[PDB]
Amino acid sequence: KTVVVTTILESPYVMMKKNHEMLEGNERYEGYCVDLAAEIAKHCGFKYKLTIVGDGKYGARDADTKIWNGMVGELVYGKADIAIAPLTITLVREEVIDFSKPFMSLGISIMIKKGTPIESAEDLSKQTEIAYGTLDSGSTKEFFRRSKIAVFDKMWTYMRSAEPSVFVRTTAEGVARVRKSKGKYAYLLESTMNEYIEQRKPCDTMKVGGNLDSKGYGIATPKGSSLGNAVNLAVLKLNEQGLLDKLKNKWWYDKGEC
Amino acid sequence: KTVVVTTILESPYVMMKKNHEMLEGNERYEGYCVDLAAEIAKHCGFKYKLTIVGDGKYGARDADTKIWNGMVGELVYGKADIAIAPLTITLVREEVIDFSKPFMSLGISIMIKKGTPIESAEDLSKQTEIAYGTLDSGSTKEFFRRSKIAVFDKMWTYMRSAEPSVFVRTTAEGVARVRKSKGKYAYLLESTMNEYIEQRKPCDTMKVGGNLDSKGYGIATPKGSSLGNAVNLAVLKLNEQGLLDKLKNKWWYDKGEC
Ligand SMILES: N[C@@H](Cn1cc(I)c(=O)[nH]c1=O)C(=O)O
Ligand SMILES: N[C@@H](Cn1cc(I)c(=O)[nH]c1=O)C(=O)O
Ligand SMILES: [Zn+2]
Ligand SMILES: [Zn+2]
Ligand SMILES: [Zn+2]
Numbered sequence: 121k122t123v124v125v126t127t128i129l130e131s132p133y134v135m136m137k138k139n140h141e142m143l144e145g146n147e148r149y150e151g152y153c154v155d156l157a158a159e160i161a162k163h164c165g166f167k168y169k170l171t172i173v174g175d176g177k178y179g180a181r182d183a184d185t186k187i188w189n190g191m192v193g194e195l196v197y198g199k200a201d202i203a204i205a206p207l208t209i210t211l212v213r214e215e216v217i218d219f220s221k222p223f224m225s226l227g228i229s230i231m232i233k234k235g236t237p238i239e240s241a242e243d244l245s246k247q248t249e250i251a252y253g254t255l256d257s258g259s260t261k262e263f264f265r266r267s268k269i270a271v272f273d274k275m276w277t278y279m280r281s282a283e284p285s286v287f288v289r290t291t292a293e294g295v296a297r298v299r300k301s302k303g304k305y306a307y308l309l310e311s312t313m314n315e316y317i318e319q320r321k322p323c324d325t326m327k328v329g330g331n332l333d334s335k336g337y338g339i340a341t342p343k344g345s346s347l348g349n350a351v352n353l354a355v356l357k358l359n360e361q362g363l364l365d366k367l368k369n370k371w372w373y374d375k376g377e378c
Numbered sequence: 379k380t381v382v383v384t385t386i387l388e389s390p391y392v393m394m395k396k397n398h399e400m401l402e403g404n405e406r407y408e409g410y411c412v413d414l415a416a417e418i419a420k421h422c423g424f425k426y427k428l429t430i431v432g433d434g435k436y437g438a439r440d441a442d443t444k445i446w447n448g449m450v451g452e453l454v455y456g457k458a459d460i461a462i463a464p465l466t467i468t469l470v471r472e473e474v475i476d477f478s479k480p481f482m483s484l485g486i487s488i489m490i491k492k493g494t495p496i497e498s499a500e501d502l503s504k505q506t507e508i509a510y511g512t513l514d515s516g517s518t519k520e521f522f523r524r525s526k527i528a529v530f531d532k533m534w535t536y537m538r539s540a541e542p543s544v545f546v547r548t549t550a551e552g553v554a555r556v557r558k559s560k561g562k563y564a565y566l567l568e569s570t571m572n573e574y575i576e577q578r579k580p581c582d583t584m585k586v587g588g589n590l591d592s593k594g595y596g597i598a599t600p601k602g603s604s605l606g607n608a609v610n611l612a613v614l615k616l617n618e619q620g621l622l623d624k625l626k627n628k629w630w631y632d633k634g635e636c
Contacts, residue, residue, distance in 0.1 A: 209479055211614040221467055225483045225592055269620050334483055334617065336594075356469040359592070362527065 123168035123347070125157055126191045126200035128176065130291060132316060132371040133206050146170050152371045156223065157204040159363060160339065160354045164347075171200065176290075178207055178258045181216075190257070192217060195342045202347055203340040206310065208259035210335075218345065219338035220352035223364055227331025228260050229311040231295070233324055236303040240329040244306060245274045252306040253279055253286025255294060260308060261287065263333060272332065298325055308332075312368075319376035381426040381605070383415055384449045384458035386434065388549060390574055390629040391464050404428045410629045414481065415462045417621065418597070418612045422605075429458065434548075435515045436465060439474075448515060450475055453600040460605060461598040464568070466517035468593075476603065477596035478610035481622055485589025486518055487569040489553070491561040491582065498587040502564060503532040510564040511537055511544025513552060518566060519545065521591060530590065556583055566590075570630075577634035 127134050133153040140148040146158075149170055161168050179192020187193065191207055194200040195217050209219045232238055236250060244252050252275070254260045264276040279286050286305075288294040294307045295317055314327040339355055341348040358364055385392050391411040398406040404416075407428055419426050437450025445451070449465055452458040453475050467477045490496050494508065502510050510533070512518045522534040537544050544563075546552040552565040553575055572585040597613060599606040616622055 209614070211611060211618055214479075214611060214614060219479070221472075221477070221596075222480065222483075222594065225594070263618075266618070267620070333620070334623070336480065336483070338479075353469060353472060356467070356472055360469055360521075360524065362525075362591075365591070 121167070123161070123166050123202060124200045125168050125170050126173050126194040126203045127153055127157070127170055127205045128173050128178065128191060130206060132375070134170075134172070152367050153204050153206070155367055155370075156358075156364075159358060160204065160351055163354045163357065164350045166347075168202075170204075178205075179213060180257055180262070181212070188216065191340070195340055198342065201341065201345070202351065206312070206337045207340055208310075208335055209338040210259055210262070213340075216343065217340050218343055218348045219340050220348075220355040222336025222338055223355045223359065224312060224337045224368075226311045226335060226337065227333045228263055228308055229314045229331050230328050231298055231307040231309055231314045231317065231325055232328050233298050233301060233303045233305075234326055236306060236328075238306055238328060241275060241332055242271050243329075245271045245278075250304055250306055251282065251286055251301075252308060253282070253288060253294070254308045255291060256285075256287035256289060259335075260310060264308075295325065312372075316372055319372060319378050321377045323378035381419070381424050381459045382457075383426045383428050384431050384452045384461045385411055385415075385428055385463045386431050386436065386449060388464055388571075390633070392428075392430070410625055411462050411464070413625050413628075414597075414616075414622075417616055418462070418609055421612050421615065422608050424605075426460075436463075436517070437471065438515045438520075439470070446474065450598070453598055456600060459599070459603070460609065464570070464595050465598055466568075466593050467596040468517050468520075471598070474601070476599045476601055476606045478598075478606070478613040480594025480596050481613050481617065482570060482595045482626070484569045484593060484595065485591045486521055486566060487572045487585050487589055488587050489556055489565040489567055489572045489575065489583055490586050491556055491559060491563075492584050494561040494564060496564055496586060499529050499533065499590055503529050503536070506536075508562055508564055509540070509544050509559075510566060511540070511546060511552070512566045513549060514545050514547055517593065518568065522566075553583065574630055577631060577636050579635045581636040 132151050134149055134151040137148060137150050173191045173194060175189055177190030179188060179190035181188050188196045191203040191205060192213055195203055238244055238250060264272055267273050291313055297305050298307045311331050317325050318327055339351050390409050392407055392409040394406055395408045431449045433447055435448030437448035439446050446454045449461040449463060450471055453461055496502055496508060522530055525531055555563050556565045569589050575583050576585055597609050
């Protein structure tokens with residue numbers, strides 16, 4: 121009956137409201153994806169319940185055990201009906217779940233503390249003084265792992281063997297590491313997040329260079345779900361009607377602190 | 379069964395080679411989409427034949443007869459098996475054909491002569507000295523017709539009724555009009571095309587402002603087609619390897635002349 125929506129606490133997509141302890145259900149949350157879920161639900165005419173993914177992950181398959189974790193796993197094992205989050209559309213995931221056309225276009229980017237003498241991935245790969253890493257679990261880390269491109273593979277060899285770990289548990293942890301490193305740590309992350317952080321106090325970070333790749337976030341459903349076709353059409357209509365642009369402005373720039 | 383691929387002569391996607399005279403079949407052509415087609419066909423193990431769409435159109439449904447024209451129509455009526463071209467993923471099209479995930483992300487942009495006192499969509503809609511239009515039977519013309527945004531509607535109420543017609547049956551005709559207008563005509567077109575033209579001699583055009591929207595091009599197949607799922611995974615695979623980026627640079631800037 122009620123559509124179970126799995127999502128992840130990742131600002132500004134989904135965040136706990138200030139007085140969330142005084143609220144119940146969907147009203148406890150706010151964000152880009154909270155607004156998008158309400159809109160998809162209104163347009164497709166269904167009732168839903170937002171639930172935060174238990175393990176706080178996006179979705180990877182463990183080799184050997186072959187088990188899918190994160191939001192992807194919730195869909196694959198039937199714990200949720202749909203995933204509305206900054207979940208990257210990838211080949212390995214499309215083999216086990218369905219994705220709508222992209223509701224957001226992005227690429228891997230470089231975040232630096234202002235003043236850091238780095239302007240590109242080639243720059244990072246060629247030097248050793250400034251450390252760099254990615255979100256430990258996700259498509260960004262997998263991009264570097266699977267890349268046959270020289271600069272990116274060179275970057276991976278270093279990241280995989282770096283001690284202590286250059287990988288981080290959450291975006292917030294990567295941003296704090298960039299902010300506290302005196303420019304000795306650069307962070308590789310999804311471009312839209314890099315832009316978001318660039319508009320947050322203390323306004324000491326910035327995106328440098330072009331994006332390393334091009335991809336998109338999609339709404340996900342279990343293969344052969346009855347919700348799949350409907351939701352894909354909703355994303356296309358919402359995009360055409362300009363809602364996706366408006367939501368980005370609201371959560372990124374209208375709220376900008378710099 | 380040899381796959382009939384429908385496409386469109388639009389540079390640098392599909393162009394007849396300089397020496398097409400002594401060549402035959404798929405050999406007469408070169409381009410971004412020619413390379414892409416060979417890639418998909420290689421990775422999915424099928425034989426194909428490139429055919430240029432009969433009416434030279436992208437695809438739109440006649441409001442009276444309800445009949446689909448262009449590349450979309452060839453797929454809908456079963457005249458072709460797959461469409462590999464700069465075809466925009468839209469809602470109305472997704473209702474009658476299948477689209478893979480985008481092989482290229484883009485948006486509507488402004489092309490000016492050079493020296494033209496226009497720096498944005500607002501600028502265009504505030505004046506009448508400079509004429510402006512779009513292509514036809516395309517997603518660009520439709521974007522302005524359906525736009526509820528104050529500025530874009532202001533532009534359409536002018537374009538729609540603008541005599542002499544500011545619309546062009548072909549991209550080449552739009553670019554030619556900008557070039558021979560003495561700066562009195564600005565053209566609204568898709569960003570990747572605008573960027574390509576800016577790198578072509580006489581090097582007298584320029585893209586100004588940011589994109590008015592965000593969309594993507596996808597490889598299209600008729601609904602129910604078994605080639606659809608395969609080709610989608612093929613697009614994701616190719617993009618992930620960095621091939622689409624490789625093909626973008628090759629045809630856009632390695633071959634640039636400015
Ligand atoms: N979108 C990713 C998760 N994810 C998120 C952020 I924000 C980032 O910087 N890198 C990632 O891999 C996925 O889907 O795994
Ligand atoms: N991609 C469009 C066609 N198309 C093409 C170009 I190049 C442009 O500038 N505008 C369009 O509508 C479609 O698929 O209709
Ligand atoms: Zn709505
Ligand atoms: Zn290949
Ligand atoms: Zn008619």
